[PDB]
């Protein structure tokens, strides 16, 4: 975990793109937040934490099922649809992703890419050699002209030539006045409904860094740096989330100084296939956590993505390509000021 982007802004500022940032990070695996000096969690938040689902899981779902006029009209055009292959490593195994754009992006190896007969581009290189290819398919555009030679070629590839199938993670944010569930649509394949793992961990007597909202690199002996928080925050999670065997359950990390000891430390961790719309809701609540006066100096929101997701050629607003395992933090202060941190592994 190395820090790429570290910025300061305010949720009340027009220039703040915190909404766009969360929304453009589609595939989120782990969502965690930490509140210093907080004993009991509020009912408004606890309901929000307990309802970040649901998501779905389908075994060996063929790709031709995702390009039918049925699927496009039902899910893609009537809401934000999300999908990603499960237990398939990007460096070697094939990987497919469905963006809320409607774009079907599949990352294939050299052998598979040739067999599909689709036009894509070299993705990852091993020197002069080519290991991975990326094929992008816009199902929103293709829906306009399903009778085109483009579509039947792509259809023929998925159906007759090279019938690919994968284990898929599925989720759907509904903006539909006409309702039809995903459990019924994919009944022929044994689809499962799932709810994200919620883990509340209360830490006693926790040493926490002292921060200054307007000082990213801090003022020596007065407040810590944003970089120091980043490493400390990752260390806290590492000890609590690992839940080691009887041999390494003792924490070895150190807290940056100047610091402050906190009696009640609440630490929540949501795990599964979390939609960015749910994270937006969570971020909004944590933002307004300081509407009432609190004992907390600040709160933290952390989001980890999936390691095995396709990496497009389009770059984000921060100067690097979208996709892959993202890892960002929101350090929320009591005046709606926040720190935005991003990292790569």
Swiss-Prot record:
Pfam families assigned: Ribonuc_P_40
Keywords: Nucleus, RNA-binding, rRNA processing, tRNA processing
InterPro entries on file: RNase_P_Rpp40 (IPR013893)
Location in or out of the cell: Nucleus, Nucleolus
Record GO biological process: endonucleolytic cleavage in ITS1 to separate SSU-rRNA from 5.8S rRNA and LSU-rRNA from tricistronic rRNA transcript (SSU-rRNA, 5.8S rRNA, LSU-rRNA); tRNA 5'-leader removal
Superkingdom of origin organism: Eukaryota
Recorded GO CC terms: multimeric ribonuclease P complex; nucleolar ribonuclease P complex; nucleoplasm; nucleus; ribonuclease MRP complex
Recorded GO MF terms: ribonuclease P activity; ribonuclease P RNA binding
Subunit structure: Component of nuclear RNase P and RNase MRP ribonucleoproteins. RNase P consists of a catalytic RNA moiety and about 10 protein subunits; POP1, POP4, POP5, POP7, RPP14, RPP21, RPP25, RPP30, RPP38 and RPP40. Within the RNase P complex, POP1, POP7 and RPP25 form the 'finger' subcomplex, POP5, RPP14, RPP40 and homodimeric RPP30 form the 'palm' subcomplex, and RPP21, POP4 and RPP38 form the 'wrist' subcomplex. All subunits of the RNase P complex interact with the catalytic RNA. Several subunits of RNase P are also part of the RNase MRP complex.
Protein function: Component of ribonuclease P, a ribonucleoprotein complex that generates mature tRNA molecules by cleaving their 5'-ends. Also a component of the MRP ribonuclease complex, which cleaves pre-rRNA sequences.
Identification of the protein by name: Ribonuclease P protein subunit p40
Gene name of this polypeptide: RPP40
